[PDB]
């Protein structure tokens, strides 16, 4: 189908705790493959997925030099942002970056990303055209006009349409046996009384990959998205994911409800209902 490669950098200044801290994590869809921490012992990009380790030392030194470079700039951008927003030193701040690309089933670039965020809020972002930018607020403009003056978008665009698109497939190739596979959710419904008048039906979905999934509670074939409680999809810790939808129901009317699970590993969606009797 269509995949995506994404990197997530986090730069944090920590006044009186030492120089800023830089952390980087990378993912191929819902799988992290590399990691870096300017605090860790190493000081090198590290593999966090088996299928990566088979790259050559040449590959890792390159990445590590990069992460070291990022570590270096960190305290600079953080200082700049401090200037741009007219803030003092005392405070503790965060500069976030997210660069990546999405490829369609064919393998052509569906769209790349290059965006930052200061202290949680949007800072600047390469527009979908990969040529113009968008500045969150007045300060952010500083970076905008500065990047335009320097055709920064150009280089980013060259990466997104080049390196990013060319690499994402090599990772998918080597990762074949796991990245390019879909494990359907193992589902089942449970009944939990809440009173003499209402029971909680809970629709389970576990051990599935990728993370995208849809659970819907239907009553007589009617979507019950309002009375449905959805827990935010979470990590099983072994690669697969979990999730469950719950809806409260009047005792007896159990059979009135049906659960719908949709995943890309299920040609035909799963549809289940609670079972107690006999």
């Amino acid at each position: 189908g269509s995949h995506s490669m994404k990197y997530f950098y986090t730069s944090m200044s920590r006044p009186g705790r030492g120089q800023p801290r830089f952390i980087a994590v990378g993912y191929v869809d819902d799988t992290q493959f590399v990691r870096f921490d300017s605090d860790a012992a190493s000081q090198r990009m590290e593999p966090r997925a088996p299928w990566v380790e088979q790259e050559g030392p040449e590959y890792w030194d390159r990445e590590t030099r990069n992460m070291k470079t990022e570590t270096q700039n960190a305290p600079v951008n953080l200082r700049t942002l401090l200037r741009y927003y007219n803030q003092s030193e005392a405070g503790s701040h965060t500069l976030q970056r997210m660069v990546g690309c999405d490829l369609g089933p064919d393998g052509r670039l569906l769209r790349g990303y290059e965006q930052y965020a200061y202290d949680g809020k949007d800072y600047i972002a390469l527009n979908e055209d990969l040529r113009s930018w968008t500045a969150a607020d007045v300060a952010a403009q500083n970076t905008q006009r500065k990047w335009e003056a320097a055709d920064v978008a150009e280089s980013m665009r060259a990466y997104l349409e080049g390196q990013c698109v060319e690499w994402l497939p090599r990772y998918l190739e080597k990762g074949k046996e796991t990245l390019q596979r879909t494990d359907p959710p193992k589902t089942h419904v449970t009944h939990h009384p809440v009173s003499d008048h209402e029971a909680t039906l809970r629709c389970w979905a576990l051990g599935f990959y990728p993370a995208e999934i849809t659970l819907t509670w239907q009553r007589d074939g009617e979507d019950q998205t309002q009375d449905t409680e959805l827990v935010e999809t979470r990590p099983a810790g072994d690669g697969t994911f979990q999730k469950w939808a719950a809806v409260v129901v009047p005792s007896g009317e159990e059979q009135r409800y049906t659960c719908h699970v949709q995943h890309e590993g299920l040609p035909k969606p799963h549809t289940l209902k609670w079972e107690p009797h006999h």
């Binding site: 990197y7 980087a24 590959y59 600079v76 741009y84 500069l95 970056r97 660069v99 980013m156 390196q163």
Partner: peptide, 8 residues
């Protein structure tokens, strides 16, 4: 592979 970083 990681891209190159520009400075704000």
């Amino acid at each position: 592979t990681t891209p190159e970083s520009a400075n704000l």
